[PDB]
Each structure stands twice: as structure tokens, then as C-alpha cells.
Symmetry: C5
Subunit: 312 residues, 5 copies
């Protein structure tokens, strides 16, 4: 009903804590995820103090009404959280214990420079607005921060869930506000990607590369163009999941390099056939023998170079 008045000028300290219960629905394209967790708050109010001996009880229970509770809000959320009060307890000295359970949709950016083998960090911001009569600051209670053993994400491993103890204080809208950071570190499970994407691509590439042992123009043309069509289908299937970024990624580089290889293979096949038509069956043979060795070595070298560039 009214914020507790200070003794002389000290600000009001509120201790926070978040205990995760469920986390799910991590969308790459929308860069959002859903959370379900506990919120704990604690502060000091001497107006609620009582004598345990006289009252005959140790802990008093209060309704959410007829008591002052600070408004804590999330910054990076789509809508306001859906929360219910679980319990409210008051100690004889005046310490208030608050607890609730909530659920919200969090918006956070992601980095896809290493998309198949990337790691991300998720941020949750807590903020509080100072009233005209009292300054409010936030603090972290490390004994009430954690997560359950059953918390799982589809396609991700959860590493740690910690918080930055030092808040950030700044002025917004002629008011002082304190902000807190809760960080959740996850890593992607890349096992399903290998046998579903990487290996069939290599098989199709090798199938395309068998035209350097044939002298039929029509058969080489069929092989190369059909393998190009299959590459296009696979590239469409891959792009239907990865969003667009203003920077270059590993997968896009590999795909572009594969298109360049297909183009060079078409060019080599045309040059072989053209030389063979003009009654020069030695230069075509030399070029074919050279290409047989040149293609796989150049492919391996460019793959090593790309891997060092992106992961070095």
C-alpha cells in the first residue's frame, strides 16, 4: 500500500532468484524460447514486525493484497508473464518471503557463424523502477538459483545457469532503474546432422566425379546435371531451416563451393568433348588424367582452409 520509509537515506535492497522447471520451444527463425520457472523475492519491512512470544506464532501469512510488493518486470519478453502467488511469509524481525510460479516467452538473438557446431548464450533481464520516495536496488541470492534434473531441450544440451551478481544502474524516464542478468549456456547436438546431410552429399559428389573415367558425352552430361539437381534439392531442404543472416556462415560457404565445383566439372566435360571432336585425342586424355587427381585434392584443401578460417 506504501513503500517502506527509509531510516535516513539507505536504498531498499531486494534479493532475487530463479529456479528453472521447464524450458521448451526454441525457434531458430524467430529466436524465441519458452520458460517455466520459480520467482523468489525478499526485502525488509519493519512495519510488519511482531513479538513471537505475545502472538504465539513464529511465521505470519499474508494475502497478496494489504501488503506492499515491488513490481518486477522482464525486459525481453513478448507479453507480460502469467504468474500466481504461491506463498507469502513474514519473519518476526520484518523480513518478507515471496514466491511465485510464472511462464513467459523470451526473445533473444542468436549467432549462426558455426551453425552445425555452434554454442549459444540466452539472456533473461530483470528490472525494477524506483518510486518517488524510495530508491530500489536488486541483488542476487546464490542459494536460490538453479534448475531441475529433468529440464531438457529438444536438440540442445544444457551446460550451466548462472547470474551476474553486479547489477546495472541507470536513469530512464527521469527514474533510476536496476537491471540484472541471468545467463543460460547451451550447445547444439550435431550427431543427427552427419549421417543425414554430410555423408549423402559426399556420395552424390563422388557419383558426379565418375565422368572422368568415361568418354561418352551424353552419359557424362546426364550424370553431372542430375547430380546438380539433387544438390539443389538438398540445398533447398537445408535452407528451409536456417534463417538469413547479415554475415557468412560455414554451411553457405560449403554449398557455394559445391556449386563452383559442379560448374568447373561441366566446363571440363565440355572442353574434353570439344578437343575430341577436333581430332586431338591426346590433349583430352591428358586433361582427363590431370582432372582425376586435381579435383579431390583441391576439394580437400579448400575444405581444410574453410575449417581453419571458421574454427580458428
Amino acid at each position: 500500500v506504501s513503500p517502506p520509509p527509509p531510516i535516513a537515506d539507505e536504498p531498499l535492497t531486494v534479493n532475487t532468484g530463479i529456479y528453472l522447471i521447464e524450458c521448451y520451444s526454441l525457434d531458430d527463425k524467430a529466436e524465441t524460447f519458452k520458460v517455466n520457472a520459480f520467482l523468489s523475492l525478499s526485502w525488509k519491512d519493519r512495519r510488519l514486525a511482531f513479538d513471537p512470544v505475545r502472538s504465539g506464532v513464529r511465521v505470519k501469512t499474508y494475502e497478496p493484497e494489504a501488503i506492499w510488493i515491488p513490481e518486477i518486470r522482464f525486459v525481453n519478453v513478448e507479453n507480460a508473464r502469467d504468474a500466481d502467488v504461491v506463498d507469502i511469509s513474514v519473519s518476526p524481525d520484518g523480513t518478507v518471503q515471496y514466491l511465485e510460479r510464472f511462464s513467459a516467452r523470451v526473445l533473444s538473438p542468436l549467432d549462426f557463424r558455426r551453425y552445425p557446431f555452434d554454442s549459444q548464450t540466452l539472456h533473461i533481464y530483470l528490472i525494477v523502477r524506483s518510486v518517488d520516495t524510495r530508491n530500489i536496488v536488486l541483488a542476487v541470492d546464490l542459494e536460490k538459483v538453479g534448475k531441475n534434473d529433468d529440464v531438457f531441450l529438444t536438440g540442445w544440451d544444457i551446460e550451466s545457469f548462472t547470474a551476474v551478481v553486479k547489477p546495472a544502474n541507470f536513469a530512464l524516464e527521469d527514474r533510476l532503474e536496476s537491471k540484472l542478468d541471468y545467463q543460460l549456456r547451451i550447445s547444439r547436438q550435431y550427431f543427427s546432422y552427419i549421417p543425414n546431410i554430410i555423408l549423402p552429399m559426399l556420395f552424390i559428389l563422388f557419383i558426379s566425379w565418375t565422368a572422368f573415367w568415361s568418354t561418352s558425352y551424353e552419359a557424362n552430361v546426364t550424370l553431372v546435371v542430375s547430380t546438380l539437381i539433387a544438390h539443389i534439392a538438398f540445398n533447398i531442404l537445408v535452407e528451409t531451416n536456417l534463417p538469413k543472416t547479415p554475415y557468412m556462415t560455414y554451411t553457405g560457404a560449403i554449398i557455394f563451393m559445391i556449386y563452383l565445383f559442379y560448374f568447373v566439372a561441366v566446363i571440363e566435360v565440355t572442353v574434353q568433348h570439344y578437343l575430341k571432336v577436333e581430332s586431338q585425342p591426346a590433349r583430352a586424355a591428358s586433361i582427363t588424367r590431370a582432372s582425376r587427381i586435381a579435383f579431390p585434392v583441391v576439394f580437400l584443401l579448400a575444405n581444410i582452409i574453410l575449417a581453419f578460417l571458421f574454427f580458428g
Copy 2:
């Protein structure tokens, strides 16, 4: 309004029960399902006791207000349940009868190691938080647990719906809590999968395998590559339903083995043609005759080996 005070130190026992009415919308990718069911609660409160002879009635009816009702919550739910009170009845000795109908979205993990022929177990957890003056524990009433005869799931058969009678007691947030387990066992209907997926794949594979009776290079190349394209289309159609897992599955193993077979077939066709070009028409014939027998036997043996590995 206030939890009933104990006699000396005994905890408060609450008997629970769940009667399923509707279950639907089982998503493989999101690992969620929707439920609609009855919730029954029963406990002891001696403050509500009355003399039936004096009052002239046997059962008293109370509104949800002006009576203490324990808060029971679900653990693995996306949001709070949408529930309404049906009836509340009080026995002359003080026993309270509670009943409601609710609907919620349950989050539960699944196992896809045997995806076409898998069985799953769904869990629903009930929890209760002890107050500062009374300890609350949960119990199971086997006479109020069941399901209707019209309960159906699209693509699944329902086997049984039971509950674990022994609760789990632990301390969370400086409070003792009791948790209960409700298990629902289902099995997948695999009839639609056979004629829609398994048989056309075998027909396409056999169509690819008819190039070991031909000596035209262009026709073999067309046959093998077109059958590869059709395999890629079918593989895309299959993957558009099965989520990614951090482990290896039956279907993915079969698909990878099919790609390997296509690669080996391409390699055999190229080797046959190359030998025939170099004026050696006996080794090519021998290799073709050997492959004719070798491919189906190796395919059958690898399929048997995979079936024992995954279902043994």
C-alpha cells in the same frame, strides 16, 4: 481459510484420483499432448463436523470460498490448468469430497530408437507444497482411477492407465513437497507405414537393380540416377515427420544403407563400362554375373543384422 490444525503431529493426507475423458493432439516434434480429465480430492477436517439428526440432512454442500482447499499443481505443464469446480460435499464426520474438470497441455519426452514399431510411456506429475503449520502428503485412491471407453488417440493404441502408489518426498525451497506419478502406456499403429513407405522403396530398389542385365551405359546411368532422385524425394518425405535425436535410429540406418547401395551400384556400372572399353569383355561379364547374385544377398543379410541389433 486456514489449514486444519493437527492433533499432535500427524501430517495431513490427501487422496487423489484422475479419470480420463479425452486425450488428443500428440505431437512427435514438440513432444506434447493435450488431456481432459476429472480431478478428485479428499481429506479430513474436523472443524466441519455436524450432527445429522439435529441438522436434518446427511450431506452438506459448500461453495469453493469460505473453505480451505489444498493447492495441487502439475509439474510438467506449459501453463496453469483451466479448471472448474463441479461439486463439494462434506460428510458428518468431517470428510470433504472434492471434484473438478480440467484441461492442460502436458510436456513429456519420447524415445524414437524403434520409431516405426515403438512404444511410449507418458507421465503426469502431481505435487503439493507444505504450509508452515501442517505437513501435507499425497495418496492414491485406486477406486477413482480409470478412463472412458471412447478415449482414442489418432495413430496410437491405449494399453493401460495406472499410478504409482508410493509418493516421492523431498525438500525444495525450504519446504517439504510430495509428488505422484501417473503413467499412460501407448503403442504405435504401424499398419499404414508398410504399403505407403516400405513396399514402394523395395520396388524402386529392384528397378535400380535391373541394370545388371543390360550392357548400355546410358540406360544404366539414367536408371540408377533417376532411382536415386526418387529415393531422395522419399527420404525428404520421411524426414519431414521424424524429429532429430542425439542417437541412431532404425529408419536412418536403413536410409544410409540404401544410399551406400546406390553408391556401390554406380561404382559397379562405371567399372563394367571401363573394362568393356579396354577390349576385355570377359572380366566385365564375370563381374556382372557376380553382382547379380551378390547385391540381394548382401542386402538381406545387412537387413537381418540391423533388425537383430535394434530389436534384440
Copy 3:
């Protein structure tokens, strides 16, 4: 506020009725549909009786509060209905007239054994729970059951909307309950299916069948395999609408039979070419001439057999 007390032991009779206004969003995969309709209720309460001459009015109007209204619920619904009270009227003898408008999502199974030319029956169940002091039963008022002339379903024709007059009485949760059945019969509009699906399939099949008048192996191989690819694309387009069922359907049988025909055609083309290679140009000619007649007759006969099996 309290159910009306019986005279000696008679149960309370409630007359129901449903007048449809809008029905839409019929999903084949989810087996759900949306409805918007009127609900009418009528019962007897002698505590509300009045003298028309003394009061000077004929019909009294009451608010939904300060009057006892029975709770009627739907069984096969995803959530509780969204309803508003329109009017409440009381006759001088005590008869209460109730009316409301609601909207709900109904869950009902479907049968796809004759998917292109199937008819379905939709069920809506009304139930009521007896109180500890009065037994409640349901009845049907045939003069308040019907539908508007503007009620339409996208892709379906509406035949009739009737109700079963005899309720079903049974004991559930130590309480007697009465249930009612409202049936809605619809038929599928199959006109759009013919020129969009059935005729192009036949054209593609006939295009595949023109290889029995050619002696070029490469051209036959191209024709058959390309027509197979187009069949696969059409089959994917068809399956993207029809859900999976634990039984065999007409369309799936036809599709499997088409795949079998393509396989046999490939086998015939290979056998023709193999015989022609071994310098036997009479047996190949005989087999080709026989196949020319054999394929269409066998196709027609198997189609007639399937049509009798599924529609006989």
C-alpha cells in the same frame, strides 16, 4: 441457489434443444470441427409461481443469478464452451424458459474406408450430473431442434440434423448421469477430385504404356522412369491430405496397384531387350504383342474387383 425439492420421489426433467447457426473448420487430420448454435433449456420450479392478476404481468424476467440453473456440459469438447445468456422467462405456473448462444470445438472420429466417396456422422453429447438431493434426467424437445438455411460446410453437403430421444443413464463417480446424442450426417463433394486427380493419372499411365510400340531401350527406359517420378509426385500430393489409418483404404490400394504395374512394365521392357540382344527377335515380338493387350485388360479387371470389394 438450491435445486427444487421433489414432491415425493419424482426426478427432475429438463427439456433440451439445439438450433445450429454456423458450422465450419472441419479438419480431416485432427478430426475436429467448430460449431455455433443455440441452447434451450426448460424445467419446472414451483417456488417461482405467481398470480398473474395480482402482479399485473404475464411473464417475469430473472437475471442468471438469484435462480437455480442446472449445469449442462459437453462431453467431446476440447475446452469449456463460450456462452452468454440471452433471455430467461418464467411462466405463472413455474415453468422456466432458458436460452443462450455458445461456440465450441467438437472432437469426433471419422472413417476413411471410402475416402473419395465417403459419408460421415458427427456426434454431440450432452450430459448432466445429479445432485445429492434430486435426480436429474434429460429429454428432447423436437420443436426446438433444427438448423438455418445458410449453414454451409466447405466441401461437404449437410443432409439432416436429428437427435436420439432415449437418453442413456449410468453411474459415474458415485453419481447418476444422463446423456443425450445429437447426430449430424454429411456427405463429401467428390466433383473436384475427378478432373484434378483421376484423369491426369490415367493420362500419365497411358503415356507410360506407349513403350510397347517402340524398340528403343533408352527411350522406353526414359518414358517409364519419368512417369514413375510423376506418379511419386502425385502420390506425395495426395498423401499430404489423407491421415494415416489402421486399415486399408481405396486410394491406397489403387496407388499400390499402380506401383505394381510400373514394376511389371520395367520388368517387361528389360526382358524384351534381353531377348533381342541374344539374337531372338521373335519371342520378344510375341511378348510385346501379348503385353499390348494384357496390360489394359488386367488393369480394368483389377479396378472392377477393387470397386466391388470396397463398395459391395
Copy 4:
């Protein structure tokens, strides 16, 4: 709180009006659209009359409570509208001025006989239910019906928004009800359809038709079948937008005619090759020369005939 009593027997007249603000989300498949608009109501109540000189004011303001407001409902809506009261004003003679802003989802059927170049009319129905003591009728105020200049629909042009002044009075549920019609006429923007659909189809058709200048069987077969596959892909792309109808449309007729042309072209190519095999190189030449002229003229004539049939 109570409807105003009549003088002798006259019914109560309510003047309505709708001013559109936003309209969006027009779904072809679901035949629904979303609206956001103003609702204006006006009637006569002499119980609210006052002397302006004595009161010292000209217009009185009332809360939505403690005043009788008629219930007006929409007929063809999925759910009840979400509305808020803007202002309520009372004139000294007793005239009440009502205004609100609402938003709803309207269900209305559509006609696709001329799908690329069709025009539609959208209907919004307002209805009111007579009370047991007063008859209520609806009227139209032409000075409060219109739309903003910024109202736009994605892919449609808005022509006019008028209303039928004569209401429809009928008896429903033993009660007299008045209904009103609000019509919104729109036309489709067909500019994007031409260069995206119509022209590439013609190019692909012409590419298929270049086999009447070649004598290679394999090349003709490749050309015709590949152009058929591309036609199938385009037809799938077109059908993924147009819903199914119980009648024949322009686009479906054109597509079927294109399939028939492809079939006839295949048949002609086979007949040419067969005649050339039997050492008759004059009849094949004559048939080819005749087809060269016959195909485009027949195509143009059938297109003209279809255009007259559907737009005549």
C-alpha cells in the same frame, strides 16, 4: 434496466450504422476475413428527458450501466465481438446516442467460377431479438455509413460499402427478430498472375511443340516428358492456393486441356516413329507437317471457346 414502455402499441426503432476502419486477412480457403469498425446506435427513451434550462447543461453523459441498451449481435461471426463503449450521450428530448469500436472475424462464402478475374460480395448481418414487452425493429442511417481512405486489402480493390435499407422480419424461437444487410464489393487484382503464371506456361508449351521439326525419337521423348513434369510442378503450385469447389472453374479447365494436349503430342510422336520404322517415310512426313499447323490453331480455338463459355 427495463425496456422503455410503448405509448400504445408502436414498436421501438433503432438506427444503426457501421464505419469501417481496418479490414484484413482475407483467406480464400477458409472464406473468412477480419474487420475493425465503429458501431453506432440510436433510439428513443422518454424516461431520460430533462429540462436544459433547469439543469444548466445541454447533453448528459451516462455510464453503460444504469441504462437500458439493446443487445445487437452479428450472425455470421465465429465468436462474439470484442467491443468497448466510446461515448454515450442523451439529448434533452430523450434521444440516446451510442458509439463503440469492435473487431470480429466474419464468415462468408465466395464464388471461384472466374478465379483469376473474379469479383466478390461480402455480407455482414446485424440482428436483434424482441423482448416480451416491446417489439424492436432496425433501421439504417445513411449519414453514418462509410469507410476511411486508408482502408486497404492485400490483393483486392474496394469498390463500395452500402447497406440495404429494408430489414427482414421473421419469427425465430417464438420471438420476432429484425435483420439487416451490409454489403462490401471487392475485385481481385490480376496483374501479378500474368507474368508469373500465364506466360511461362506458354513458353513451356511452345518448348514442348518443337519436336515436330525433329526426327530423333529420344530427343522428342525427353522434350515432351520433361515439359510434362514441369507442367505438373506448376499445376501443383497453382492448386496449393485454390480451394476445391463443387463446380468447374476456368483454371481447372485450362489445366485439363493442357494435359490433353500433352497426351495427344505423345501419341503423335509415337505414331510418327512407328510409321518411320516400317519403311514408310512419306506418311510420317505428311502427319508431321499437318500437326505443325494443327496444334496451335486448335489450341487458340479451344481457348477462345472456353473464354466465351466462362465469360459470356
Copy 5:
């Protein structure tokens, strides 16, 4: 409870301001986006004035009730905003300070004439309706308009967020209303488009163009038609993102020009083969040599012409 009465005739001035926090979910097809921001309001009310010395306080705090607050509404929104009051403060002279946080879905049109390299301007309109006793006008407070440093849009860069200081006053529904404009300028990130779309198209075009160095009809036909099929697939992939417009765009022009090039290439290949069949192997050679130079130069010139037309 009542608008503040004017001194003689001056209108009431309300100062507004918007501070953006989050913006997300920009849909090209639906032309909508979601916002989360602060709303600030300020006006003058002398009825709330107080003596600071007598009261002993500097700023008074009021609940949203028991105080007059003007109704401010958004024009181009799908639904009403979801807002909560943060703080309300009153200065000793009577100035009222208002603040809230809200979230809404904004509807605004877009221009796609330069789709890959376009810039858009988003509009947000604030409006207020004058009461029958006071005229209300809106004003802009430049010291409370801005955005956070963490505001990001997926695939867009944010340039500036300003407002037009001059409002628009007009009469609507017999009432004077003031409207304000808030403009947000963004630019598209076109980096991901180049290596994913533009370069593979050029590679496929060049692969098609290698048939002017070959004299095999079948191989040229395969190359051109397969490259056409791949172009069709890419065009479908591009159109699955860009909505339809009543005007011509850059991308659609390029796609149509590519189809025209494929048609002309088919025509050239047919003409070459026809001349070669008629024993004229000099004109075919001349036409091939001319086309080799003509195609790339014409392609470059038409691309330059289109680029000047659309960006000049």
C-alpha cells in the same frame, strides 16, 4: 471522473511520447509487425493542486481510478493494446504525469518495387476524441521519444524513430479528433541474398549456355531442359516468400527475362539441328558462332537497362 473545465475557451493539450523497447515479427505477406514500448502522457488539471508546505510532500500518487485520464487509441492496430499503468504522479501546480507499458500488433503497407534492396517506413497513429464539454489536442514531447540500444529486427537495420510535431485535426462522427504520426525507417539486409540466390542462378545459366560449343542434339536438349527445370524450382523457392503486388518488381522482371532467354536458346538449338539435317553445315556454324557472342552481351545489356529503369 469529469474532464477539467476550461478557463474560458482554451482546448486541453496532452503531450505524448513513445519509447521503444522491443520490435519483432515483421511479416512481409501480412504486412504486420509487433511492438513493445512505453507510453507517456501529460496534461493540466488545476482541481488536483495542493500546497507542498502544508501537505509536507512534493509529489502525490494516485490510483488509475478516482482521476480523469484521457482515452488514447491506436488507429492501425488489429486489436486493442494490452497495457498496464506503471506510475501516476501529480505536481503541486496540477500537472499530471502518466506512464504505461503496452504491446500491440501494427498493420502497415509496404512497397516491394526494389524488393532485394528496398527501404520501408512504418507508421503508428495516435488519436483522441473530443468530449462534449472540452476540446482535446495532442502534442509531441521530443525529450521522451527514443529507443533502446538493444532493439533489433531480424533481417533489417533500424535507422531512426521520429515523429511529426504538427497534428492533423478533422471532424469524424460529429466530433473533432486529433491525430499524430510516428515514423520508423528501416532498411533491408541484402547480404544473404547474393550467395544464396544470385550466384547459383548465374552458374546454372552459364551451364545452359555451353550447348553452343557442342553438335550433339540430345545432349543440348538435356542440358537446356534440365537447366530450365532447375530455374523453375528456384523460381518457386523465391515466390514462396514474396507476396503478390499490383505492380511490376525487379525480381519478377529478371525471372521473366531468364525464361525468355531459355526459350530463345531452345529455338536456336532447334534451328541449328534443322539446318544441319538439310545438308547445310555452314549456316549452322555461322549461327552458332554468332550466338556464342550474342547471348552474353544481350544479357548484360538488358540487365544494365533494367537496373537503370528500376533504380534511376
